[PDB]
């Protein structure tokens, strides 16, 4: 409704004239803005006739009630607003170019917090894991051979694997002159490997919001 002292409708509005078989109202919105621009371009004078006999349109025992009813007959030659296009309405009336799209769409709540998959614990490529295993076996064989040159049989493999994981695992350390250097060099590789693995997971844990993608009804 217009303000008691407003009188005429304020800017960005048009005089709504709700009519039936009196009060002044202001009608504004999307389609009204379209109507104003059409009048300015085409160059006619409009007169809103806000309907009250029904809804956007329906057929009752051969009678059209609503905006289509008014457009039908000769009561008002336009029905600007929210009017869908279908065969029945387009058969008795003459629509225009669709300025807004519509349809029977589906609304689905987005799945907040996508969870990392089961295989999210492997930032390393399959060749990355295989190469690490082969190097561990080669290093273990080198350590045992060096120790034999100057006991330990399976301890080297046990010790070699412990360093790559958390060091908190009991293990006998093979004493020697150069075998220790090999252990340290492997130990540095374990530290560098573990740091890289933990760093990657931090990048993998950063997920997004995933919404189920239906096929469209």
């Amino acid at each position: 409704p217009a303000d008691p002292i407003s009188g005429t409708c304020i800017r960005d509005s048009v005089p709504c004239r709700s009519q039936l078989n009196p009060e002044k109202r202001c009608c504004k919105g999307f389609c009204i803005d379209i109507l104003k621009r059409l009048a300015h371009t085409i160059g006619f004078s409009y007169d809103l006739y806000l309907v009250t006999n029904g809804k956007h349109g329906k057929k009752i025992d051969g009678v059209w009630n609503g905006m289509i009813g008014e457009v039908f007959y000769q009561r008002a030659d336009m029905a600007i607003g929210s009017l869908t296009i279908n065969e029945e309405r387009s058969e008795i009336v003459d629509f225009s170019v669709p300025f807004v799209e519509t349809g029977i769409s589906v609304m689905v709540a987005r799945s907040n917090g996508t969870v990392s998959p089961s295989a999210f614990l492997e930032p390393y490529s399959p060749a990355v894991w295989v190469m690490m295993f082969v190097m561990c076996l080669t290093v273990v064989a080198v350590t045992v051979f060096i120790f034999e040159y100057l006991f330990t049989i399976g301890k080297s493999i046990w010790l070699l694997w412990a360093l790559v994981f958390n060091n908190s695992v009991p293990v006998e350390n093979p004493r020697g002159t150069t075998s220790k250097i090999m252990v340290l060099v492997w130990a540095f590789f374990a530290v560098i490997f573990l740091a890289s693995y933990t760093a990657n997971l931090a990048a993998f844990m950063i997920q997004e919001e995933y919404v189920d993608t239906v096929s469209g009804l």
Binding site: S168, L194, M205
Partner: protein
């Protein structure tokens, strides 16, 4: 309050500029503050828009004052009626918002892992340890097995009695590997949470979706009857904003800043030359966004005033060759005043754990001593 011409004393940028102008052209000035605090706008009264010139603009136009030295913005409406000298300061509308303190999160240390995950690892340790004891006793103790499994997961050196059987050894190694995976996953998850845990982004200009879609939770306004009001009314794209600001439009440039500090407001849109000073002087506010109505100030004068030519020259010559830096760096620029750090959200959970263990330890020792008594 007398409310009738109480003699005060003024000083500052504009007054300093006025004194310089008077000296260089022989004025004799008598400053006089506007009767009603208001910059000036065209109001409609009795179907006569031009009849109502509210604020200091009306005072100059009516005849009370023949010069309007003040931070008066230059725009079309005023330029049509009064004469504006060359700008003495270039500015533009900008948004001032309260600085958001970077608080932390993760009130508990166990947040990264769900309650089920903690239980799964808890029973996993027990099941793994018991199976190791059975394998060791098979010959292809429980206390030793429990100590070893617990120590490996917690990364402690209390481990003793390493498994001897090959089947036990392989199971233990895989158990240790699982321990590394769990701890590494926890740290990676925490790093992702901490990195992605930052305060809400600031407005960052008039193009922000928050401003373009006004909501009751956001209260941004300006000063009533100013150039900001005129700028928004003229535009048609900024249709939603004006209706929102018209609701909470304030009464002065000082009240609005106080509201922002008190949290009653959320975003003030005003001249950048003034907001940038308040942010610098007051260490609580930060101006965001980019200037979107770049204009200047001006010593407005009546259309027939003969001072226009020798004020405009005086501004260009004196003010903006050796003077602007002197004045600006003295009254505007001279006055001068990081990711969150875990403080007591992580420690509270961890500390309660340590204290909780100590009370349990005191109970365990009493129980242990009682058992040893018999």
């Amino acid at each position: 309050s007398p409310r009738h011409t109480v003699p005060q004393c003024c000083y500052g940028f504009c007054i300093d500029l006025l004194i310089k102008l008077a000296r260089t052209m022989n004025f004799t000035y008598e400053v006089h503050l506007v009767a009603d605090g208001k910059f000036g706008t065209q109001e409609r009264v009795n179907n006569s828009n031009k009849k109502e010139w509210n604020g200091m603009m009306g005072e100059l136009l009516s005849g009370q004052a023949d010069m309007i030295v003040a931070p008066l913005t230059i725009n079309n409406e005023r330029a049509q009626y009064i004469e504006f000298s060359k700008p003495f300061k270039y500015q533009g509308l900008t948004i001032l918002v309260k600085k958001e303190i970077p608080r932390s999160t993760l009130d508990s240390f166990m947040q990264p892992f769900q309650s089920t995950l903690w239980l799964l690892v808890g029973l996993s340790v027990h099941v793994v340890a018991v199976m190791l004891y059975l394998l060791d006793r098979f010959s292809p103790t429980l206390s030793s097995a429990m100590w070893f499994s617990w120590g490996v997961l917690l990364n402690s050196g209390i481990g003793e009695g390493a498994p001897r059987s090959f089947s036990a050894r392989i199971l233990g190694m895989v158990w240790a590997g699982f321990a590394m995976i769990i701890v590494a996953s926890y740290t990676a998850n925490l790093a992702a949470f901490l990195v992605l845990d930052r305060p809400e982004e600031r407005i960052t200009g008039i193009n922000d979706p928050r401003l373009r879609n006004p909501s009751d939770k956001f209260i941004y306004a300006t000063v009533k009857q100013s150039s900001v009001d005129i700028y928004f009314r003229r535009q048609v794209e900024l249709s939603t904003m004006y209706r929102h600001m018209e609701k909470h439009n304030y009464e002065s440039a000082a009240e609005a800043i106080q509201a922002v500090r008190d949290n009653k407001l959320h975003a003030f849109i005003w001249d950048s030359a003034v907001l940038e000073f308040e942010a610098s002087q007051k260490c609580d506010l930060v101006t965001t966004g980019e200037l979107f109505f770049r204009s200047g100030f001006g010593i407005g004068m009546r259309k027939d005033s003969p001072w226009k030519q020798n004020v405009s020259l005086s501004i260009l010559k004196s003010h903006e060759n050796g003077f602007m830096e002197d004045l600006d760096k003295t009254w505007v620029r001279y006055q001068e005043c990081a990711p969150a750090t875990l403080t007591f959200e992580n420690m509270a959970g961890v500390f309660m754990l340590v204290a909780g263990g100590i009370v349990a330890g005191i109970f365990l020792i009493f129980i242990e001593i009682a058992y040893k008594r018999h």
